[PDB]
Write a protein that binds this DNA or RNA. Structure first.
Lengths: 100, 99
DNA sequence: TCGACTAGTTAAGAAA
DNA sequence: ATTTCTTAACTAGTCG
């Protein structure tokens, strides 16, 4: 039926719907990502490559970011800033921005 | 999911089909105004192309393409189309009956 | 409910 | 990116 992702943190896992997530970014903690949800961030163990491979909507817009295409509100290609439905934003690399 | 890209110079804003009530031509040549639930967006496009996108986008009038999904009611005598967000547009005599 | 005569207006291609 | 020129095609109103 539904499409969800398991975010693992040690003995925890938190379960979240694909489109509950705006984007992922790499954490300052090695081997952890930050899922940016509608109204809170979640830190968890994962890799951006694997996440981008999950679904066509998850696109590697930047070495440090995988964005959920479904939650992109707008794109400024000059500045290469991607804005999301929840008012957050991230940055896109020069090479990848046009292909979002 | 079905969404549309509204292009403003280097900007593009991305909006879901049914977030949009209708489009109207702007006073600025070659621009349209997308009427959303709680905001209007000006952008470059043509009504013909938009009406071709989907069966729900119907050219009810030379200056308007309406999203059938968001039509609340229709007064055919006055030829006024009302939308779920409490605004309206007009339909041309020829096209009103075919909405 | 329909055409049909009029007169004023505009969408969108080209092109700049 | 935004505009100028262009005109076929549109529009509302009227009248029957």
């Amino acid at each position: 039926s539904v499409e969800t992702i398991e975010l693992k943190r040690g003995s925890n896992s938190v379960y979240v719907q694909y489109d509950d997530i705006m984007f992922f970014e790499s954490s300052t903690k090695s081997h952890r990502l930050i899922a940016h949800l509608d109204n809170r961030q979640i830190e968890f163990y994962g890799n951006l490559k694997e996440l981008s491979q999950l679904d066509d909507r998850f696109f590697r817009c930047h070495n440090s970011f995988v964005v959920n295409r479904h939650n992109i509100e707008s794109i400024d290609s000059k500045e290469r800033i991607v804005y999301f439905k929840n008012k957050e934003h991230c940055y896109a690399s020069v090479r990848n921005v046009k292909k979002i």
